[PDB]
Coordinates of C-alpha atoms and ligand atoms in Angstrom, one line a residue:
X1 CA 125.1 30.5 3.7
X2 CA 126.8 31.7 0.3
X3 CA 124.7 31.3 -2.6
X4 CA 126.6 29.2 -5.6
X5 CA 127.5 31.2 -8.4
X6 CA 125.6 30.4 -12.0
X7 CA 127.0 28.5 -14.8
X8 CA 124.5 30.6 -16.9
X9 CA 121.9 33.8 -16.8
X10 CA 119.5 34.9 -18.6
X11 CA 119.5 38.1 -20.5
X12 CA 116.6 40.0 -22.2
X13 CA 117.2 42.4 -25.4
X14 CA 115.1 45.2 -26.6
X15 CA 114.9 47.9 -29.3
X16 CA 112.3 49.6 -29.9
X17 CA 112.6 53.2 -32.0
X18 CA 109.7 55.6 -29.8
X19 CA 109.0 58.3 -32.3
X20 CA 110.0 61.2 -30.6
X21 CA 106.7 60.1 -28.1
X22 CA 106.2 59.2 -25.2
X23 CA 105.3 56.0 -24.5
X24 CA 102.2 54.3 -22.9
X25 CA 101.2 53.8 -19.1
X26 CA 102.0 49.7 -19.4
X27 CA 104.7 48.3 -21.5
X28 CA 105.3 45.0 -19.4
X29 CA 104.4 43.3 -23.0
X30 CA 107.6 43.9 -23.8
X31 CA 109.8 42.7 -20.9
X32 CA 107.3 39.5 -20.7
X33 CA 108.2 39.2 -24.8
X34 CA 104.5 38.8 -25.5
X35 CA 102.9 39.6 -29.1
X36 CA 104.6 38.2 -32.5
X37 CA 107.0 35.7 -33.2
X38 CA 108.7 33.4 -30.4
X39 CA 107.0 34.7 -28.0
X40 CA 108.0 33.5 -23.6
X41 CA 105.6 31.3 -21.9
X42 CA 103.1 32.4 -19.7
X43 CA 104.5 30.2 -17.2
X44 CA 107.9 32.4 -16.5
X45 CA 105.9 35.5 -16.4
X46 CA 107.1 36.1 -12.6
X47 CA 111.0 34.5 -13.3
X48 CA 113.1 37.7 -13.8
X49 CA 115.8 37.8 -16.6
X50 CA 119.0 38.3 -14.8
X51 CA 120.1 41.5 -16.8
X52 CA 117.8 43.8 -18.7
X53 CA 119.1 45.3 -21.5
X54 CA 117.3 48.1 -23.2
X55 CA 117.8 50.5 -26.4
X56 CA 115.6 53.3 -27.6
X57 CA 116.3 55.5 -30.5
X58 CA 114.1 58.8 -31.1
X59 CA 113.4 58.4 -27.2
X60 CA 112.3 62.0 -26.0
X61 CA 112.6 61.1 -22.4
X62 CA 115.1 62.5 -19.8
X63 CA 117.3 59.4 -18.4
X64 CA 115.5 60.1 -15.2
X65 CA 112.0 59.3 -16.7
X66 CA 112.9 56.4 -18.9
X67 CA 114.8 54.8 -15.4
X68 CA 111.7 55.6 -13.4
X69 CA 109.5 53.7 -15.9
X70 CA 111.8 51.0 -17.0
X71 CA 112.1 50.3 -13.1
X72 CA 108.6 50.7 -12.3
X73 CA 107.4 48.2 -15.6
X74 CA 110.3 45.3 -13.8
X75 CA 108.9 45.9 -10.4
X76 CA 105.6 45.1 -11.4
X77 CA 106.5 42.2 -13.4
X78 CA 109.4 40.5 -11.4
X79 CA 108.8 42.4 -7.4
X80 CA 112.2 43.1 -7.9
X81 CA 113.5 46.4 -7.6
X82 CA 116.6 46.1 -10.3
X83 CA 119.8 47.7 -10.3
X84 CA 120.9 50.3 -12.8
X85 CA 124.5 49.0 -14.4
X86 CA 125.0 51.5 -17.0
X87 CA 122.8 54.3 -18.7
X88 CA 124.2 56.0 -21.6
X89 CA 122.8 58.3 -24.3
X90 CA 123.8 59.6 -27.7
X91 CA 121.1 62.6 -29.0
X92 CA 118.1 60.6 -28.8
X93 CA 120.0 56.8 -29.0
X94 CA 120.0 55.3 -25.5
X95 CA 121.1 52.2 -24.1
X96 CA 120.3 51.2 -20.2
X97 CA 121.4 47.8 -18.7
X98 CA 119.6 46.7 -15.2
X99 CA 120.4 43.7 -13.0
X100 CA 118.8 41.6 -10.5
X101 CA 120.4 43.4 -7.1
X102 CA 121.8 40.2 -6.2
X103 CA 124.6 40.7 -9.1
X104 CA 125.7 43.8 -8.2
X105 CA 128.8 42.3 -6.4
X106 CA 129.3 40.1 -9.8
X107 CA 129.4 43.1 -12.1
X108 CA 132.6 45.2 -12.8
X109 CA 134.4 46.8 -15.2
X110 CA 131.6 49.0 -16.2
X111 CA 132.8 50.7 -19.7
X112 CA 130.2 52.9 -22.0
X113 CA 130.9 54.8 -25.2
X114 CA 129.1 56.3 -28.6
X115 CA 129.9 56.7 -31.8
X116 CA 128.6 59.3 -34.3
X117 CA 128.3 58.2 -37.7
X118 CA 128.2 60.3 -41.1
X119 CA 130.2 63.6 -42.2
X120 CA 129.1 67.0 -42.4
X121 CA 125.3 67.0 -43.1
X122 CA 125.0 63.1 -42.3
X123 CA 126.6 63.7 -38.8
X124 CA 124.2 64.4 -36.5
X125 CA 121.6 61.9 -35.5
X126 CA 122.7 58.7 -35.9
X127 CA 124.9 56.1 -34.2
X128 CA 125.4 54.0 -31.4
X129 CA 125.8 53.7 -27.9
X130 CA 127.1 50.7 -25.9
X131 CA 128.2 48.6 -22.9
X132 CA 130.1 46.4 -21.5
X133 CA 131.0 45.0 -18.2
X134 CA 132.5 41.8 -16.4
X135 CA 129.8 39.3 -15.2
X136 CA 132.4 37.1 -13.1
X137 CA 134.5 35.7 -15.3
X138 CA 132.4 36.6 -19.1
X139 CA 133.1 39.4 -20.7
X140 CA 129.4 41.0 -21.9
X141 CA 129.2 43.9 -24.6
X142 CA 125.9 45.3 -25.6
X143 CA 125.8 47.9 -28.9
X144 CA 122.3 49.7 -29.6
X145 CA 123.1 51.4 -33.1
X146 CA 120.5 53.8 -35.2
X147 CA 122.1 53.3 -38.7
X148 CA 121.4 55.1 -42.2
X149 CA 117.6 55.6 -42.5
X150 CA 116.2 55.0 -46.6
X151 CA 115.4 51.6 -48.7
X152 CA 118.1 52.9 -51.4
X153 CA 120.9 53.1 -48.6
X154 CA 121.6 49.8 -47.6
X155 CA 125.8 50.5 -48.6
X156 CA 125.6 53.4 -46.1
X157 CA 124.2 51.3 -43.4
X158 CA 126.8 48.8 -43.9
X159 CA 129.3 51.5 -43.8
X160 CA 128.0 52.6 -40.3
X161 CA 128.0 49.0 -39.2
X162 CA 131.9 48.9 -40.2
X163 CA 132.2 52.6 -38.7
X164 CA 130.6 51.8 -34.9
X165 CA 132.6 48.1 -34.9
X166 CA 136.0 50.0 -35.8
X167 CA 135.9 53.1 -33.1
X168 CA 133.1 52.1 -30.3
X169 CA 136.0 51.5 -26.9
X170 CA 134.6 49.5 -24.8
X171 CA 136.3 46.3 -22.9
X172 CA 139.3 45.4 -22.2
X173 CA 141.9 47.8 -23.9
X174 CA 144.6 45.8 -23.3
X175 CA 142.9 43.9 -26.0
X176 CA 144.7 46.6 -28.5
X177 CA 144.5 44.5 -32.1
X178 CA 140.8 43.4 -31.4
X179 CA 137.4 45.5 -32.0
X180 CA 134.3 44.7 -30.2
X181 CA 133.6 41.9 -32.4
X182 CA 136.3 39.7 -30.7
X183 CA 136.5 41.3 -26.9
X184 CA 133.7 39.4 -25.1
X185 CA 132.4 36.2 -24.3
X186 CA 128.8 37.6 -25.8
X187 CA 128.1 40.7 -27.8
X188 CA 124.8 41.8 -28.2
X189 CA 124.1 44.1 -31.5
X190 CA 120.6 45.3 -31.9
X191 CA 118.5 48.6 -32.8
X192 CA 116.5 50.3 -35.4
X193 CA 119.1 49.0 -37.8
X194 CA 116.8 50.3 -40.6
X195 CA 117.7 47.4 -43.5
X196 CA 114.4 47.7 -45.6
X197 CA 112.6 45.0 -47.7
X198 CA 113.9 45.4 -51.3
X199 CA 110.5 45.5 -53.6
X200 CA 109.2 47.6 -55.7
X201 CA 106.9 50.6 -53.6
X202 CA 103.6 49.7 -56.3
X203 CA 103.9 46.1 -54.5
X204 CA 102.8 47.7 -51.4
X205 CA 99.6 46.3 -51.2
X206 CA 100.6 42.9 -52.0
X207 CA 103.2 43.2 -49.5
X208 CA 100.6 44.5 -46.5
X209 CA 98.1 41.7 -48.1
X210 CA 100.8 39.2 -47.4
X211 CA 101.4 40.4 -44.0
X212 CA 97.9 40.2 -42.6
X213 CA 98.2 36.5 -44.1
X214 CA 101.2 35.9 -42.3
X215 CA 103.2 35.1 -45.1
X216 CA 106.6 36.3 -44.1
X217 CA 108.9 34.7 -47.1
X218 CA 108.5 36.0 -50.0
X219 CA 109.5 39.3 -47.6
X220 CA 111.8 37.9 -45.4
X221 CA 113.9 36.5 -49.1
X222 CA 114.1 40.5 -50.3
X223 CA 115.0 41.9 -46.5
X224 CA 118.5 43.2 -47.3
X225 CA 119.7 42.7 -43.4
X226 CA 119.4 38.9 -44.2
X227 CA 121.1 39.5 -48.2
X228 CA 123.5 41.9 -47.4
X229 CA 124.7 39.3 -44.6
X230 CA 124.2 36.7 -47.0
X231 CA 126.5 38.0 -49.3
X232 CA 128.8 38.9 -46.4
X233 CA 128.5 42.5 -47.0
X234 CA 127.7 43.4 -43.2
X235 CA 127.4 41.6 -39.3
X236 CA 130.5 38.6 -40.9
X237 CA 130.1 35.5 -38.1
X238 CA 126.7 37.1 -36.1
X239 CA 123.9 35.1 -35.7
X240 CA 120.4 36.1 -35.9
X241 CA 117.6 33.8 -35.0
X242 CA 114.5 33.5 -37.5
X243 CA 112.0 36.4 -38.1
X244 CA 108.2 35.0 -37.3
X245 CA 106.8 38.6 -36.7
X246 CA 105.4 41.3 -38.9
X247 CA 107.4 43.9 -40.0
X248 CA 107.8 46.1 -37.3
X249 CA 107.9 49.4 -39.3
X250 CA 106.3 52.1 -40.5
X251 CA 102.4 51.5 -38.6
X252 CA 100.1 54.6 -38.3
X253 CA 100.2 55.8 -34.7
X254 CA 97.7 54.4 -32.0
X255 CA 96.7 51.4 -33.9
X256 CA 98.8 48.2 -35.2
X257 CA 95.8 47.7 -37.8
X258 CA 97.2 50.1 -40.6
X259 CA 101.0 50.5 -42.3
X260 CA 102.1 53.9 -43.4
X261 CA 103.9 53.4 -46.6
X262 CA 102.9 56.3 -49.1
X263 CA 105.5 59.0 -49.9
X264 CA 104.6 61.9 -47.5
X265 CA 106.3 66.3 -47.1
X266 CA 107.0 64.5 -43.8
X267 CA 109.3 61.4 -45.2
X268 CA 111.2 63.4 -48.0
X269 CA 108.6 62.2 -50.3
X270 CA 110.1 58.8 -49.3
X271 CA 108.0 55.3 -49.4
X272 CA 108.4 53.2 -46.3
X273 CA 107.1 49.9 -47.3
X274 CA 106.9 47.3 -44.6
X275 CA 110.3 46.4 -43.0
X276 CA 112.3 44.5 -40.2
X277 CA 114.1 47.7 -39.0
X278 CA 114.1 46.9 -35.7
X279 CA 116.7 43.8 -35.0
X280 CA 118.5 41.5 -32.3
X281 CA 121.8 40.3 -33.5
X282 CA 124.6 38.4 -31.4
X283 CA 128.0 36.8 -31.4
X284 CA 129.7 34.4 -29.0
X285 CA 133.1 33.0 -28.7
X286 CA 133.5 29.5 -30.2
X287 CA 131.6 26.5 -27.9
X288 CA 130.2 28.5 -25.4
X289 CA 126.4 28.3 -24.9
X290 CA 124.1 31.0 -26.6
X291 CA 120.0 30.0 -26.8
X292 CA 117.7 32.1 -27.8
X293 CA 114.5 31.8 -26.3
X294 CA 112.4 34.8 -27.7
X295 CA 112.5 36.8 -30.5
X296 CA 109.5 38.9 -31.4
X297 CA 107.4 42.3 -31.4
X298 CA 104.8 43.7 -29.3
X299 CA 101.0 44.3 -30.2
X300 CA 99.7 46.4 -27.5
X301 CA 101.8 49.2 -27.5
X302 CA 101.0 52.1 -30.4
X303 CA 102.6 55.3 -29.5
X304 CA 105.4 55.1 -32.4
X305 CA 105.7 54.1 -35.8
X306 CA 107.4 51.2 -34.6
X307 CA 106.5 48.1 -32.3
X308 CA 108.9 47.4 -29.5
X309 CA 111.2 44.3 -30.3
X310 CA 112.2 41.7 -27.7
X311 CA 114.7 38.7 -27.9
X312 CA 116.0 36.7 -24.5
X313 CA 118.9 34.3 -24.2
X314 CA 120.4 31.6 -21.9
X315 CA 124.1 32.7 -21.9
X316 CA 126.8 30.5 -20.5
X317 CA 128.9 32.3 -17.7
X318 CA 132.5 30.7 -16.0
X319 CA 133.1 31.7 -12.0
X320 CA 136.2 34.2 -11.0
X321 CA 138.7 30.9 -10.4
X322 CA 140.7 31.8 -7.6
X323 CA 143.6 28.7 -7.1
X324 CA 146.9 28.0 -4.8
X325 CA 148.6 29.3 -7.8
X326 CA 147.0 32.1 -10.5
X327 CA 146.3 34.9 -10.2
X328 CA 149.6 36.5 -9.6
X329 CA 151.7 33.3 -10.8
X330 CA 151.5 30.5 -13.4
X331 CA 150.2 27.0 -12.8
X332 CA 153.2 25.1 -14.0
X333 CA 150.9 21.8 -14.6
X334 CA 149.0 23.8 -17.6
X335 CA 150.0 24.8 -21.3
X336 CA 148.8 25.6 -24.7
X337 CA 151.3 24.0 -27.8
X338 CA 150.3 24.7 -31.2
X339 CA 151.6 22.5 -34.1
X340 CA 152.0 22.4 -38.3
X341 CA 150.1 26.2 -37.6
X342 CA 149.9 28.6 -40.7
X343 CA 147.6 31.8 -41.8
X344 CA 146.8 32.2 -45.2
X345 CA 145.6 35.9 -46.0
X346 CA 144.0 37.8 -48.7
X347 CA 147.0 40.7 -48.6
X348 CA 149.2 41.8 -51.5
X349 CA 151.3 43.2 -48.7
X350 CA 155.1 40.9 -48.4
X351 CA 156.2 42.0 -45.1
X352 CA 157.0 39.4 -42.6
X353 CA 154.4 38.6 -40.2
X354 CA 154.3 37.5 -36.4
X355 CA 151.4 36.7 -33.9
X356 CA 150.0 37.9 -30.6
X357 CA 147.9 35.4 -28.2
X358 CA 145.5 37.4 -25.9
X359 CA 143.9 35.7 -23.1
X360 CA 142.6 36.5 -19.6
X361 CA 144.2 32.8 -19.1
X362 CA 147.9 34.6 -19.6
X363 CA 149.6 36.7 -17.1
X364 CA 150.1 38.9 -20.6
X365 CA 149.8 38.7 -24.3
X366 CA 152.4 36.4 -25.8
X367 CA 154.7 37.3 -29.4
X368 CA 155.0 35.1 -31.6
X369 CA 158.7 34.7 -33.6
X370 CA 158.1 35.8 -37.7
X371 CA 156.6 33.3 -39.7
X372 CA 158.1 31.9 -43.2
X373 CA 156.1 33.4 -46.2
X374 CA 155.4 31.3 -48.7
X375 CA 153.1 32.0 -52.0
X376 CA 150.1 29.8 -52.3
X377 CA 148.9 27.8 -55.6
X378 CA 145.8 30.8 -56.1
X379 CA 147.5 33.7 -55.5
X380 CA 147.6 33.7 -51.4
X381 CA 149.7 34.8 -48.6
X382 CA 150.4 31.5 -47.0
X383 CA 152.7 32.6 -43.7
X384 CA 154.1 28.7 -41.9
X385 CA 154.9 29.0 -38.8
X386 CA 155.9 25.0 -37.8
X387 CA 156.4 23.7 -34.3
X388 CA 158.2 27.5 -33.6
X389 CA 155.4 28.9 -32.1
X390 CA 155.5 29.8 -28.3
X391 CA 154.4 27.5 -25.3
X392 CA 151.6 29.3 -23.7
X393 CA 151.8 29.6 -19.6
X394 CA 148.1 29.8 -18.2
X395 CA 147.9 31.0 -14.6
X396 CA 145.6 27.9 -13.6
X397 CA 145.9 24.6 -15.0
X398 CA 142.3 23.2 -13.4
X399 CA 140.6 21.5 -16.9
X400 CA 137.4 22.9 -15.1
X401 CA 139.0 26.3 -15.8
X402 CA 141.1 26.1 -18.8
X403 CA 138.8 23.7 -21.1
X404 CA 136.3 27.0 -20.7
X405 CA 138.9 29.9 -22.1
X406 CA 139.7 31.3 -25.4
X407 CA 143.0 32.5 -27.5
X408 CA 142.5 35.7 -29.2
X409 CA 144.8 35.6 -32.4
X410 CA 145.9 38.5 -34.0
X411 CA 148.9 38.3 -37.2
X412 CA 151.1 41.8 -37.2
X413 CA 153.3 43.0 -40.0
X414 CA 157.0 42.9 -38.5
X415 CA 156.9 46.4 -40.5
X416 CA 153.7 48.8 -39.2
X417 CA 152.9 46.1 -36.3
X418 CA 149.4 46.3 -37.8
X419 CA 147.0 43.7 -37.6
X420 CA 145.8 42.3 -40.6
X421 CA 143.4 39.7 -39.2
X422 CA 142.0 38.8 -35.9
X423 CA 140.3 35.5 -34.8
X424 CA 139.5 33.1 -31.9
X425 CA 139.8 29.8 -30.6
X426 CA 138.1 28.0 -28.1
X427 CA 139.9 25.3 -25.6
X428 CA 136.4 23.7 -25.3
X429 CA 138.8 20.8 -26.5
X430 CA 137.6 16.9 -27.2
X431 CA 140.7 16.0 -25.3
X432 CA 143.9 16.9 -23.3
X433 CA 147.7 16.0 -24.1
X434 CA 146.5 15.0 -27.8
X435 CA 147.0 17.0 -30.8
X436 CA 143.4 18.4 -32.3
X437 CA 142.9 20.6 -35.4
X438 CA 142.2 24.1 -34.6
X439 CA 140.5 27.1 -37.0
X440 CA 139.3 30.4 -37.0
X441 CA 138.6 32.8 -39.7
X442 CA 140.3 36.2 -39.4
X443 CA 138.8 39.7 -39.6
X444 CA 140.1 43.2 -39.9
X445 CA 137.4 45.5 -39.0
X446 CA 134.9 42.8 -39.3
X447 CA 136.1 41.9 -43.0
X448 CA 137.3 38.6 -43.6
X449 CA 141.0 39.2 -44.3
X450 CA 142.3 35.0 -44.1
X451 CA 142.2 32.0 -42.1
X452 CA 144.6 30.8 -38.8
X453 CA 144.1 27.2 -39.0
X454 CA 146.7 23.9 -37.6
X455 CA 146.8 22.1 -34.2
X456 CA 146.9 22.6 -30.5
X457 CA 147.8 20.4 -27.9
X458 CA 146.6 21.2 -24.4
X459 CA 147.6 20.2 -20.9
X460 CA 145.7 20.4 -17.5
X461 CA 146.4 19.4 -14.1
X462 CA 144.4 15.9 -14.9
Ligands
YC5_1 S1 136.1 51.0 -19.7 C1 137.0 51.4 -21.1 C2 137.8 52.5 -21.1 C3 138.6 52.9 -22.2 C4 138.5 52.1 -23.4 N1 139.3 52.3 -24.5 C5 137.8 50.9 -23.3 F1 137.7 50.1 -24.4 C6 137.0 50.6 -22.2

């Protein structure tokens, strides 16, 4: 009587910073995503999410007692006990990921890990924790970061983004040229990211004035999360959806009525002017479906300085295909064929490059022969590599597999076999056995470093 397994789940995000307190006796607000914003419909109150994810940064609680609660608050909610995944803690920066019980035979590959960010006297509090897992066959990574606190330090923020994206280990290490931002099917990045709203502190008023009016843009235009990513200084290729809350930083305790902005012995004679520290930022692989479906702050619960911040999406999730052939052999029917291919990248380097394709589609990563350098009109690296790259061998060739997988692309100096960019493309293709035009970007710790762009031609068994 085997249930069928789902095409898609839902997750729920949330961050909330605690304050070094404790919190209340009832935060179901928050796992119901009711207050500000896009908030859930009454209507689902009693539909659990399928995975709970949650981050807390200045949380004073022992995992035991944040587990007890967190459980406790579902329970309540859902009547479903849920099922601890993961729990890991940095200092005061923890992440926890539940599931409904009835995935606990889906989950696997269970991976944490934390990094510290800063030197000397700026190592010590901040960071991030994350996770990841297998959820059948997607790949999930969840990263709950407490960046750089300070409106005037927006660079170092961006430097602790670039830090956390660079050394954080979690998936598949096998995956050796790719960070986090290429490893899974979804990452989730979220916490008190602490990006400030850039006016001047004797606007305070007028900014808390046009708060209670709920007048968000003139705000939302000077938030530097949303410039700096603008300007592609920070988060390159995550999405975000739209901010329809209040700022969710710095209230005076036990009310949401009043924000503390004033320059205090307590702040370092800092101003905290009304901000969006608190955040829910994701990425997916090319094609696959990502909604979100709430994204917004709580109301009724006061014990911090900040209010709890939700977000929930409908993620698209594949089956562990099992055929006659793969696993353990190829599907002779299948393969990938790229044509006219070429990389143009932003190096002064002239080595000769090459290319790995990584994919849980391939028995193993594939190498690429060295690609023909040639100098580009503007400057550029343009490296050709014709009709000579590889024919790619997936281990099933069932189009109701294949047409859902993805080719990780990274381009390696023949000298240092370092990888200058990294990028992805899906084979959520418009056809079979026709040649398409395929394109990615390419990154090297999350900066664009070029462009992978030409044709693929794919064949199934149909
Ligand atoms: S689970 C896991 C273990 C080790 C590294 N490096 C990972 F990325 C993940």
């Amino acid at each position: 009587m085997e249930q069928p397994e789902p095409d898609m789940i839902t997750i729920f995000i949330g961050t909330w910073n605690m304050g070094n307190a404790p919190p209340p006796k009832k935060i179901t607000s928050w796992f119901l995503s009711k207050g500000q914003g896009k908030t859930r419909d009454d209507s689902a109150d009693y539909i659990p999410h399928d995975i709970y994810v949650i981050g807390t940064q200045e949380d004073p609680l022992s995992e035991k007692e944040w587990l007890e609660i967190l459980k406790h608050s579902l329970q309540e909610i859902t009547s479903v006990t849920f099922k601890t995944v993961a729990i890991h803690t940095l200092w005061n920066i923890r992440i926890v990921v539940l599931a409904k019980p009835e995935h606990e035979n889906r989950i696997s590959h269970i991976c944490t890990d934390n990094v510290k960010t800063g030197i000397a006297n700026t190592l010590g509090n901040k960071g991030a924790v994350g996770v990841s897992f297998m959820f059948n066959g997607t790949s999930l990574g969840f990263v709950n970061s407490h960046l750089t606190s300070g409106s005037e330090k927006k660079l170092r923020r961006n430097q602790n983004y670039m830090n956390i994206l660079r050394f954080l280990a979690l998936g598949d290490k096998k995956l050796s040229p790719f960070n986090i931002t290429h490893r899974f099917t979804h990452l989730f990045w979220f916490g008190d990211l602490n990006y400030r709203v850039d006016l001047p502190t004797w606007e305070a008023e007028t900014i808390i004035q046009k708060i209670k009016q709920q007048q968000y843009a003139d705000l939302l235009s000077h938030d530097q999360l949303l410039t700096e990513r603008r300007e592609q200084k920070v988060f390159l290729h995550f999405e975000e959806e739209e901010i329809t809350f209040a700022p969710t930083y710095r209230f005076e305790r036990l009310t949401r009525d009043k924000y503390a902005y004033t320059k205090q012995k307590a702040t370092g004679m800092k101003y905290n002017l009304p901000s969006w520290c608190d955040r829910v930022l994701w990425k997916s692989y090319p094609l696959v479906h990502v909604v979100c479906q709430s994204y917004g702050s709580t109301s009724d619960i006061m014990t911090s300085d900040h209010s709890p911040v939700f977000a929930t999406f409908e993620a698209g999730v594949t089956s562990q295909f099992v055929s006659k052939n793969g696993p353990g052999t190829v599907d002779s029917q299948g393969q990938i064929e790229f044509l006219r291919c070429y990389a143009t990248l932003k190096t002064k380097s002239q080595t000769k490059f090459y290319l790995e394709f990584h994919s849980s589609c391939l028995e193993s990563f594939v190498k690429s022969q060295e690609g023909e350098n040639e100098e580009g009109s503007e400057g550029e690296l343009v490296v050709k590599f014709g009709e000579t790259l590889p024919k790619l061998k997936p281990i099933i060739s069932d189009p109701e597999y294949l047409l859902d997988q993805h080719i990780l692309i990274s381009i390696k100096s023949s000298d240092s076999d370092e990888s200058y960019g990294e990028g992805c493309i899906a084979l959520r293709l418009e056809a079979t056995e026709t040649q398409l035009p395929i394109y990615t970007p390419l990154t090297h710790h999350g900066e664009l470093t070029g462009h992978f762009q030409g044709e693929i031609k794919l064949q199934t068994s149909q």
